[PDB]
């Protein structure tokens, strides 16, 4: 079993990778970081590098990290998805607050 | 790992309505004659409204089957995907949108009886009935098409940005509109740096981008050499041909291609030469020529049978074309799905 | 500078605050973005976003004007704290109409 995704890396290089289906995200997020780094040098990009207390993990496009303990098949990842590799410093805190207003009035109020 | 996809019964297409129309016979040669002239004009406008309505039915029908290539991605999940069928009745199997252009309406005009002799025709109605036939005999901007089933190959001749623009638009139209069990696709190419986006699409799989003819000959030609020579089919014939049509793309300029080409192909295949090599480009019935502005020219073909009507090449389509990025964006979205 | 936080509007009015990659080009994001707004509306009990006939999905400014699909989100003047809109824009291609007189 396998799945294929665009794994984004530094400054927006699209890279494509082959990943296992059933092993959980934490057990692969280390080795995947090698091959993204091994390729990055051949494009002439710097490998992924940052400082401060924290770590690397896989993310969705809004900054949300995935669950560390479950298959990509237990989350909904399927062939041709896109994901980010990102630096999660200790300072990181996320909003998680959503609000309702007529999308028709906000857009128009910008000019009304 | 892929999502399942079961295809429904098709949605009902917008019906085309024919019109058998017999023209206004001209006036034959003061305050009376204007009333005669003015009535003739107004009967003509009511034929125009009959024409315009029948033209609108044809626009709706053809767009509903052959969308613009950039819209294809948003449609990808819907039951409009993988809709086309081989089984005889479907006229659009093997037909692919190559651009936009002219086509001839479903009106069928009857010549005006008792036509006055050239010296006897009245001036105003004469020219008016003439222009009406010149312009209302065609409808502008419909999706122009090529049939795979009609010719062994189609030489693409032009600068690289254009030829590769067209070829990727063709590839993803086939991929959206025809399923993988009905169309399979091969590249033989040296610029593997153009055919990377093709990783994703399922139609490029098999039960397959290749570097030179010697290589293709071993894996693919061992299958594809196996039989035949080209035999132009049609919609009703489509019921009999075995399910996967192959499209093969030749991009390398190797002389080793002489064997299959001088032999007049095989059934189940269709070549596009992207190079412009002389072995492919010697038959005007089989050649698409690109102006710098992307206007393609070819011999004219019949709307209903695709048979060639003339030996002089003429306007055919304004090309629509997709970049390597847009192709890969579409390619990933499709890569998600399976039977 | 590696990410920017912006609010994304979705159909009929939910805003979700998101932290995006600031240098990938926008067309790389609009599909997986649609996945997230739908996943959140489905749990929240709303009706999801859907396509109608022929068109494309675009990520636009709150003004409605779409962003250039090929440029980076830093190359466009989108800053942390701005907001965006995920939207369906219909196909405008149709036959030409000719009248002789």
Residue numbers in the entry:
A (entry chain D7): 19 to 130
B (entry chain C1): 1 to 29, 97 to 274, 285 to 416
C (entry chain D8): 18 to 118
What text does the study give?
Further classification of the extended state reveals EccC5 to be more heterogenous beyond NBD1, which suggests that NBD1 is more stably bound to components of its own protomer. In the contracted state, the flexible arms of EccC5 extend from the interface between the DUF domain of EccC5 and the cytosolic domain of inner EccD5.
Here we reconstituted the ESX-5 T7SS of M. tuberculosis H37Rv in M. smegmatis to obtain a structural view of the entire T7SS membrane complex from this human pathogen.
